[PDB]
Design a binder for this molecule. Sequence first.
Ligand SMILES: CC1(c2ccc(Oc3ccccc3)cc2)C(=O)NC(=O)NC1=O
Ligand SMILES: [Ca+2]
Ligand SMILES: [Ca+2]
Ligand SMILES: [Ca+2]
Ligand SMILES: [Zn+2]
Ligand SMILES: [Zn+2]
Length: 168
Amino acid sequence: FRTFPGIPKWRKTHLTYRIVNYTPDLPKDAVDSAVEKALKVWEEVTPLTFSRLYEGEADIMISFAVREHGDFYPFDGPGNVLAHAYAPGPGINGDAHFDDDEQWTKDTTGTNLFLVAAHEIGHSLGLFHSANTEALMYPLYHSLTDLTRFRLSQDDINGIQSLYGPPP
Ligand SMILES: CC1(c2ccc(Oc3ccccc3)cc2)C(=O)NC(=O)NC1=O
Ligand SMILES: [Ca+2]
Ligand SMILES: [Ca+2]
Ligand SMILES: [Ca+2]
Ligand SMILES: [Zn+2]
Ligand SMILES: [Zn+2]
């Protein structure tokens, strides 16, 4: 696994998140379901807990946008960058942005929102890109022959427990 330069990480285990807006591609309840599941993948193997806010500034502000959207890294239309996220820290740090020029899905038919969100949350928690082809944090998108098979690799678990420890 890799961490970011200087190893920034949250200095607390109870984190907040806010879904600021929604992609047209799925029902809101599906987006909420995909986001909750992506957070739980990391909650289950650490002491971290995520609490949903509906207004104000959460630690992890999740939003969907296209092209230029208020940071130094514009999106780029369909394909290429799918989303991006910032390492732990205040303000824009920790936030996750999803390119709404992608087609977001709940399955294998497009760009799986759960999958990509799970990878971005890794970044929001302090993990960079792994060299392991089976890691969730490996930098190469691939959807899945059955999502029910999905499992964090040991490389992802060890990265995240190195920063935050195992569940108490
Ligand atoms: C290219 C890239 C990305 C995003 C989500 C991914 O989801 C995965 C990761 C591994 C396996 C299957 C899906 C993969 C790459 C990635 O490297 N980093 C990222 O933050 N956004 C991106 O678009
Ligand atoms: Ca894109
Ligand atoms: Ca933030
Ligand atoms: Ca879209
Ligand atoms: Zn952005
Ligand atoms: Zn990545």
